[PDB]
Design a protein around this ligand. Structure first.
Ligand code: HEM
Ligand code: HEM
Ligand code: HEM
Ligand code: HEM
Lengths: 146, 141, 146, 141
């Protein structure tokens, strides 16, 4: 999306400190706990009963790395998000049947996870920039839905 | 938050629907699928084309459940208890899609009942559908 | 906004039969009756306590006529809604202080009014083409909001 | 709806807030104005620069209103009665803006409560802020 040069440097600076596999499994974990109906796609994963079983589920961690890895590689192409995620958008629509609203819930959860891991370094201007990106990513992935 | 006037407007308008409820149900669904393509993700096993009997059968089930609510407007939580559990623990439809269906349901009524769809009745129906949607998502978490 | 040859033809055809003065008066009135909190922007319009009073308000009728007239002028420029409504967008933001969500509510009420007036003529495909238009006009007006 | 376990969690987390309630409420507003600029349309009569007395003063009232809600979680409609009348008949804020403020509150609590912001507490707080919003907008029509 349209981020000023300083906003992009802000986004890139903080992400370099992120453990992609850790945050990935933590963002998807809280997505399934806070918004339980998102579990409709993960019935084949196993025990999703309690918050503890979901956070400690290995299959939930496995997918979380896969999702956050695609997101991570996406930041290298912020000036062309629709072009980068054009294929994933088709797949999530015609084969996975994932309601795009799921992308907006995860983006918000990802922002809360970043506030938790970084604390006071996740200042208001920094949050402002990351919101535009979780929204830009969510829009690109929902672009090919028909 | 449904006042006596609202309830009267609802019974009056839904009473004039009567036997055509099933046809109106299927039309509302058809309008939603075309105008809001995302909602199609919840029916990948259906033949979502014009005149589809599957959609007509579902439209009838939705319309009857609404007829059930209008008859128990003063006790909706218990009359839809079973439906609340089904959508919350099995179907898992994201809450935003209920507003999309409600709108399409209002458009269908307005296109079939012109003289009955006054700006006051319009107000009551919208509040009624929002209350139906609150009960259907009340047990999501 | 992007419309298929059939959609563009449907929207143009139906809009030729529309009496902008009467449809706009019906649309603004129903917005104030169905979603009462929108009445905050028109404290200087008079009696808005009851539905018959809102619909019979001459100031409500006159304003709906200007709004739909401006909407009408944008229909001739579906290819560049952002550039056309740029001035109005900046006005509703800097001087009017209108929350952009109101543009979306009006767009849906207008769809309910077109359905009421035309009956069977407003078929599902026609409505799908009109939801696309009102969503695009709402985004073009909420574009310059900073 | 709020379960007994949810209530225990919200009271535990809010108990840790304590004195810093007013300061956090001010930061939650600043975060909202920057991320979602359309909310500024409800504050034209406020100086929205960093650390202005008006935003700090409003932040404290919003914090006090939340504290009373937690102290009366078993009966929020009667506790938030006057405030709901105020947002319904005068302020008339579109309901969509209540979600933007709740999100910004969660981000703030998450950035200041490293030990208490567990997944189970994150959930209960999101439900609690959903309930407060519903009660504040229950008299809109
Ligand atoms: C920012 C968002 C997301 C990104 C970048 C993303 C990325 C991916 C990727 C890389 C795959 C692998 C596809 C392949 O191997 O061909 C995938 C699979 C999938 N995604 Fe997403 N996704 C996102 C969000 C979501 C969300 C929120 C859900 C659901 C609540 C979801 C559910 C799925 C499912 C069920 C699969 C298949 C898993 C499997 O078969 O192993 N995705 N996604
Ligand atoms: C006014 C609100 C709604 C009402 C009254 C309603 C009513 C119902 C009823 C009566 C059933 C059938 C129960 C049975 O099998 O015995 C059902 C099933 C279903 N509903 Fe809803 N529903 C509502 C909204 C939604 C929305 C918004 C969606 C999705 C976009 C949805 C998706 C489904 C699905 C997937 C089924 C299963 C269809 C099948 O394969 O048999 N519902 N609903
Ligand atoms: C499709 C959407 C809209 C269009 C194209 C539109 C267009 C306009 C136009 C052309 C004017 C006249 C400016 C002037 O003479 O000073 C105007 C004024 C105004 N608009 Fe909009 N508008 C839209 C939506 C809305 C909505 C939905 C609201 C409010 C709920 C709104 C509230 C206002 C107000 C309050 C004025 C000033 C009235 C007065 O001075 O008494 N507009 N708008
Ligand atoms: C967590 C939800 C909310 C709570 C608990 C809340 C609480 C309050 C309280 C305590 C007041 C002070 C009233 C008095 O003077 O007695 C107030 C005023 C106000 N609220 Fe809310 N509010 C909430 C959400 C919203 C939202 C989301 C907005 C909109 C962007 C909003 C806009 C306002 C405005 C415009 C005022 C008047 C400010 C002034 O002139 O001083 N409120 N609210």
């Amino acid at each position: 999306v349209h981020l000023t040069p300083e906003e992009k440097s802000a986004v890139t600076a903080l992400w370099g400190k992120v453990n992609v596999d850790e945050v990935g499994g933590e963002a998807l974990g809280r997505l399934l706990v806070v918004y339980p109906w998102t579990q409709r796609f993960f019935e084949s994963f196993g025990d999703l009963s309690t918050p503890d079983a979901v956070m400690g589920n290995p299959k939930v961690k496995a997918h979380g790395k896969k999702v956050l890895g695609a997101f991570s590689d996406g930041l290298a192409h912020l000036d062309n998000l629709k072009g980068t995620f054009a294929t994933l958008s088709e797949l999530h629509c015609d084969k996975l049947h994932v309601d795009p609203e799921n992308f907006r819930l995860l983006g918000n959860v990802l922002v809360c996870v970043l506030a938790h891991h970084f604390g006071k370094e996740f200042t208001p201007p920094v949050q402002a920039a990351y919101q535009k990106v979780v929204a830009g990513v969510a829009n690109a992935l929902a672009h090919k839905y028909h | 938050v449904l006042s006596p006037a609202d309830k009267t407007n609802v019974k009056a308008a839904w009473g004039k629907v009567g036997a055509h409820a099933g046809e109106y149900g299927a039309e509302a669904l058809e309008r939603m699928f075309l105008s809001f393509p995302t909602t199609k993700t919840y029916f990948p096993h259906f033949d979502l084309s014009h005149g589809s009997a599957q959609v007509k059968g579902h439209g009838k089930k939705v319309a009857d459940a609404l007829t059930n609510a209008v008859a128990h407007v003063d006790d909706m939580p218990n009359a839809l208890s079973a439906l609340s559990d089904l959508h919350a623990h099995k179907l898992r439809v994201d809450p935003v899609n209920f507003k999309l269906l409600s709108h399409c349901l209002l458009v269908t009524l307005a296109a079939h009942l012109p003289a009955e769809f006054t700006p006051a009745v319009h107000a009551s129906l919208d509040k009624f559908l929002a209350s139906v949607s609150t009960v259907l998502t009340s047990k999501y978490r």
